[PDB]
Amino acid sequence: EKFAFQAEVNRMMKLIINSLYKNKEIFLRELISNASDALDKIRLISLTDENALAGNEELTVKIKCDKEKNLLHVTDTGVGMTREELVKNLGTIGVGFYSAFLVADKVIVTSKHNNDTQHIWESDSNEFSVIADPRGNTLGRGTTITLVLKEEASDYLELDTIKNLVKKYSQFINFPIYVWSSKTKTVWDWELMN
């Protein structure tokens, strides 16, 4: 259940944290980029596999802010990852996934792939672990990237910073990207960004 990062991964992380201190908001582009890629794979999978889109019927990317908990979630209904995939793809080696540590003290990755049960991968960057999601299969199919934001990144909880950023990066993504926001006597609901 517990693992150490490959030596190259530790170097990547430090290198990222050091050569990108200026453009931290880049993390959201990378994550939105990975969602889009996971959505292409299931889509390609659904060409020769009529069952492939069973666990979930939609192909989207939904982002929600949670202040009280200090969290930021990025969920896609792409191919998702198996337990073995979470361990190889996120523990061994275009900034990438680890750009998530530019704004987070902790990174959690919940993922459900058609060929396995929903798991959770977690890391504070000094090590990581994969466990079976005791909450069962709640995603259907896909991945949720949850970031435990650092103190200085708290401005990424404000729905306006997220929206401005999401629109820029949701420009070339051929999939609907929503942001759970509010309206005015104030109800919360998804808001398409692209």
Ligand X SMILES: Nc1ncnc2c1ncn2[C@@H]1O[C@H](COP(=O)(O)OP(=O)(O)O)[C@@H](O)[C@H]1O
Please tell me whether residue 86 adopts helix, strand or coil conformation: helix
Starting at the earlier edge strand, list the strands of the sheet with 177-182: 2-3, 128-132, 119-123, 104-112, 142-149, 71-76, 61-66, 177-182, 188-192
For residue 111, the minimal CB distance to ligand X (Å) is 7
Total binding residues toward Mg ion, as defined by CB under 5 A: 2
Which residue in 37, 66, 84, 155 binds ligand X (CB under 6 A)? 37
| 34 known member of a binding site | yes
Burial 24-50 (b: 16+ CB within 10 A, else e): bbbbbbbbbbbbbebbeebbeeeeeee
Any contact of residue 34 with ligand X (CB under 6 A)?
Answer: yes
Residue 183 is given by DSSP the state -
The CB-of-162 to Mg ion minimum distance in angstroms stands at 20
Pick the closer one to ligand X by CB: 81 or 173.
81
76 annotated binding-site participant: yes
Q: Restricting to residues 15-34, name those near Mg ion by CB under 5 A.
A: 33-34
- Neighbouring residues of 135: CB distance < 8 A, sequence distance ≥ 6: 118
94-133 residues in contact with ligand X (CB under 6 A) are: 94, 96-97
Q: Which of 10, 46, 56, 89 binds ligand X (CB under 6 A)?
A: 89
- Minimum Å gap between C-beta 68 and ligand X is 25
Annotated binding residue 89 = yes
CB 163 within 8 A of CB 183: no
Residue numbers after which the chain is interrupted (C to N above 2.5 A) read 93, 184
Structure tokens that stand for 72 in this block = 């930021």
Annotated binding residues for ATP:
34, 76, 89, 97
User: Which positions lie near ligand X, rule CB under 6 A?
Assistant: 30, 34-35, 37-38, 76, 78-79, 81, 89-90, 94, 96-97, 143
User: Which positions lie near Mg ion, rule CB under 5 A?
Assistant: 33-34
